[PDB]
Design a protein around this ligand. Structure first.
Ligand SMILES: OC[C@H]1O[C@H](O[C@H]2[C@H](O)[C@@H](O)[C@@H](O)O[C@@H]2CO)[C@H](O)[C@@H](O)[C@@H]1O
Length: 499
């Protein structure tokens, strides 16, 4: 089917507080009469781009922010429109994580980082280093226990150890990522994955262990430690295991460096319910009461909402979470993240299962990511060329229109027309000598067709106007067709050049 007008469908991962979120949905339905249906499909992060490209899927998708730049580039997410008053309700750094090409593409919900979770009755004192763990596992087998179990199927859980001694995804220097500098097969990444492979080789961990297997072992007290995020605390609470939440152990004297996620809520570009989605997210979910309902189901981590974080921050489990977060790094949201995760997933599973060697595994991953970065570079180049061409076309149409020139109070005399200035917004942080990105946002419609939106200024000596355009891809291999173009000049009514 296709997205249904007049209700909301929400997708969120099955490890999160989806029941709590449904409760917030029910409140919205009681107050407004709008039905909110929460679903938690498997492989949500892979299903969404498939269905959203055919105008299907949820109105709202929840995932960590790392997936969202990819979705935005593909036109699957609507730019969100929160006013200044609302934006002020959330921490600036959380908004930063959902910024793509300088625009907001989702609402931040909560900061997630992995910590070491330990059973206090089995280990009153948790180990400071990865290195102590094999000896620890020896003392525990004698009591039939084991030292450590965590999900070896998802590289999110293995990444902190790979990064510890020097591994990195993309070289982050000052503000920008150099995607041509990937650190997944450097000496640092090798040591970490090697050490993990050794735990398995030496039978302290089993390569087949996944999320549910690790969680069950810890929650039943069969293993003394696990590695997991805030969402997992709720089930441990139920289990009546006495647990602490603490800093990940060091590797080679250095902190484990978890990749930190900001759980975020994006609106499907193809949804006919964008204003309902906005109202739900801003007025119901991102409230103390709304986040409480979700958090009480499964802990969110450190929430983006300042007023409610003030309550949560008291929790030592949250302090531990933020302490691991500060030792790690906020994930990029660049579109190459999906490729990075796929490559590293295959590397870890292949190296764990003894299939490929560590050096074979990481080389293949590195090659894959480098290849993905190369095509991604070409794609960005094509996009800038295309945007430049769109801007140039609209500048021509605007500048040649006699009514618009009159509104701009152009000085057109016998020598010729006044040369007009055209430049991008505006307002997009630190691009001076009037040198600005001139970038379009992309949205798919319910038919799956690509629309390009662009805003820019045109300036005469007397007036500065703001131009908005919307172009639609042709079914041919033609240039995009302009379907809406209008100009706002201070003092004057909006002028529609194309209605
Ligand atoms: O393992 C690769 C996977 O890592 C992250 O996913 C985390 C997610 O952020 C957490 O919220 C929780 O659901 O566990 C997931 C790992 O299973 C990235 O967000 C994701 O893109 C990536 O594929």
């Amino acid at each position: 089917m296709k997205i249904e007008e007049g209700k909301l469908v929400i997708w969120i991962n099955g490890d999160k507080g989806y029941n709590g979120l449904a409760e917030v949905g029910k409140k919205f339905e009681k107050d407004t009469g709008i039905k909110v249906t929460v679903e938690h499909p498997d492989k949500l992060e892979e299903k969404f781009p498939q269905v959203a490209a055919t105008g299907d899927g949820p109105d709202i998708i929840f995932w960590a922010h790392d997936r969202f730049g990819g979705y935005a580039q593909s036109g699957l997410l609507a730019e969100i429109t929160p006013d200044k008053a609302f934006q002020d309700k959330l921490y600036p750094f959380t908004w930063d994580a959902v910024r793509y090409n300088g625009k907001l593409i989702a609402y931040p919900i909560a900061v997630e980082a992995l910590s070491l979770i330990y059973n206090k009755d089995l280990l009153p004192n948790p180990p400071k280093t990865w290195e102590e763990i094999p000896a620890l596992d020896k003392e525990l087998k004698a009591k039939g226990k084991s030292a450590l179990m965590f999900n070896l199927q998802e590289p999110y859980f293995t990444w902190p150890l790979i990064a510890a001694d020097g591994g990195y995804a993309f070289k982050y220097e000052n503000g920008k990522y150099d995607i041509k500098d990937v650190g997944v097969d450097n000496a640092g990444a090798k040591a970490g994955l090697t050490f993990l492979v050794d735990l398995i080789k030496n039978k302290h961990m089993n390569a087949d262990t996944d999320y549910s297997i690790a969680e069950a072992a810890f929650n039943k007290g069969e293993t003394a430690m696990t590695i997991n995020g805030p969402w997992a605390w709720s089930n441990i609470d139920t289990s009546k295991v006495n647990y602490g939440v603490t800093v990940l152990p060091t590797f080679k004297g250095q902190p484990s460096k978890p990749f930190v996620g900001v759980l975020s809520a994006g609106i499907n570009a193809a949804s006919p319910n964008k204003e309902l989605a906005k109202e739900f997210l801003e007025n119901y979910l991102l409230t103390d009461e709304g986040l409480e309902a979700v958090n009480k189901d499964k802990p969110l981590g450190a929430v983006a909402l300042k007023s409610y974080e003030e309550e949560l921050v008291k929790d030592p489990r949250i302090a531990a979470t933020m302490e691991n977060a500060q030792k790690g790094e906020i994930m990029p949201n660049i579109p190459q993240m999906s490729a990075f995760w796929y490559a590293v997933r295959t590397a870890v599973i292949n190296a764990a299962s003894g299939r490929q060697t560590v050096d074979e595994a990481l080389k293949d991953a590195q090659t894959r990511i480098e290849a993905a970065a190369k095509e991604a570079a070409a794609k960005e180049a094509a996009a800038k060329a295309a945007d430049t061409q769109l801007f140039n076309r609209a500048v021509s149409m605007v500048e040649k229109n006699k009514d618009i020139r009159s509104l701009l109070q152009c000085d057109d005399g016998i020598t010729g027309k006044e040369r007009l200035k055209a430049y991008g917004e505006l307002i997009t942080n630190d691009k001076w000598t009037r040198n600005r990105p001139i970038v379009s946002t992309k949205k798919l419609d319910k038919e799956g067709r690509t629309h390009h939106y662009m805003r820019f200024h045109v300036e005469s000596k007397k007036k500065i106007a703001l131009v908005h355009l919307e172009a639609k891809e042709s079914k041919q291999n033609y240039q995009p067709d302009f379907i809406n173009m209008y100009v706002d000049v201070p003092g004057e009514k909006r002028y529609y050049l194309i209605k």
